[PDB]
């Protein structure tokens, strides 16, 4: 079942990517931002900045050096400013990318090379494993997680009273279907008969709030009788 659920989910990934382009928006956005910035840089060459012509060749073709220098100076001032603007925005943008890259590297380490207990860090659910796929100017992570599908109400007790002693589950939680008490692990319903090996004994019944009364089976007792 788990293998089938896994295979199915990978199938859906293929479908999603094949259908909708928007899925890779973050990557596309980065591309678009850099393209717009360069387009702007190129267009600023067409700006006159108060000079007679934006074309540098026109200025020197029309004017002698003393006059030409004034017009060239305006173009230089404008073009240098334009490029400074570009470089500054790129530095800021690069720092945003470096942050993303550091995050991608961190996830590569803690999600692909390991199993993360950090919540949501590797996808919504309880992270199992994750697989990296190269993407243009980016990385894509397929996070396989475990999500509990179907759930049921049970009445629960913090502890049970046996012989005036309080039994708490070693791991797990006490549950009652309504008639019989069992101990199940929290994440998946596997009821087991409450036994001495499923429980540890601390203190007495009196201090524990919400304690219920249920027999705790001892495996050794039958063996002695037999």
């Amino acid at each position: 079942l788990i293998a089938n659920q896994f295979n199915s989910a990978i199938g859906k990934i293929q479908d999603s990517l094949s259908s909708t382009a928007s899925a890779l928006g973050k990557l596309q956005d980065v591309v678009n931002q850099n393209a717009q910035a360069l387009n702007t840089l190129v267009k600023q060459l067409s700006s006159n900045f108060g000079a007679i012509s934006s074309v540098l060749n026109d200025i020197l073709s029309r004017l002698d050096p003393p006059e030409a220098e004034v017009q060239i100076d305006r173009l230089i001032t404008g073009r240098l400013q334009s490029l400074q603007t570009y470089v500054t925005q790129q530095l800021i943008r690069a720092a945003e990318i470096r942050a993303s890259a550091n995050l991608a590297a961190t996830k590569m380490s803690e999600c692909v090379l390991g199993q993360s207990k950090r919540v949501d860090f590797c996808g919504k659910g309880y992270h199992l494993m994750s697989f990296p796929q190269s993407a243009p100017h980016g990385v894509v992570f397929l996070h396989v997680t475990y999500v509990p599908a179907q759930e049921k109400n049970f009445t629960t007790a913090p502890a049970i009273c046996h012989d005036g002693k309080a039994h708490f589950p070693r791991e797990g939680v006490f549950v009652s279907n309504g008639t019989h008490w069992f101990v199940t692990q929290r994440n998946f319903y596997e009821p087991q008969i409450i036994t001495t090996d499923n429980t540890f004994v601390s203190g007495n019944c009196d201090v524990v709030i919400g304690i219920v009364n249920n027999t705790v089976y001892d495996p050794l007792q039958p063996e002695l009788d037999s």
Binding site: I2, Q5, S16, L27, L103, G123, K124, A135, G138, N153
Partner: peptide, 23 residues
Amino acid sequence: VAYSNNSIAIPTNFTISVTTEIL
């Protein structure tokens, strides 16, 4: 949420889910 002092909800099944993170 169906909160009660003596009620718990335990999952009886699971779903393996693959989600995509793009960086």
